[PDB]
Amino acid sequence: PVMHPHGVPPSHRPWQMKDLQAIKQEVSQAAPGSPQFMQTIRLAVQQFDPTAKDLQDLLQYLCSSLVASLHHQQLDSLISEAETRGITGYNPLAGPLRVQANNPQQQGLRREYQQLWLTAFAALPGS
Numbered sequence: 001p002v003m004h005p006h007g008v009p010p011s012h013r014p015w016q017m018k019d020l021q022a023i024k025q026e027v028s029q030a031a032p033g034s035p036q037f038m039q040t041i042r043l044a045v046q047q048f049d050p051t052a053k054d055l056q057d058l059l060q061y062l063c064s065s066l067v068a069s070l071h072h073q074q075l076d077s078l079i080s081e082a083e084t085r086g087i088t089g090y091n092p093l094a095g096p097l098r099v100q101a102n103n104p105q106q107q108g109l110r111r112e113y114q115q116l117w118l119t120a121f122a123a124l125p126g127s
Helices: 017-027 035-048 052-062 065-085 107-123
Strands: none
Touching (some): 017 035, 017 052, 035 052, 035 107, 052 065
């Protein structure tokens, strides 16, 4: 998660088990990508403002190995398409995209990465 308190520099902190547990229990048996699943995960992304790495960890914790593999493939395609368009806050001469999306200071890029990560669930059967 990225902590961005008012008027102080942002910083990354690791996921805490109690936070992950609450997300998993709220999702319960809702199919990945379903309206109930997305309603919960959208709120989790807002509350914890996760980096790209944090989102990989959340996907791995919440979903089966199969769903995670499908999501990985879909998001990789969406990222390639987004790079062709240009992405808010992404400088192609700086770090790898996913490194930049782990930089707490690059909030605009992280938020756009979050949107792509959420959108990748739409490719799954279920919804």
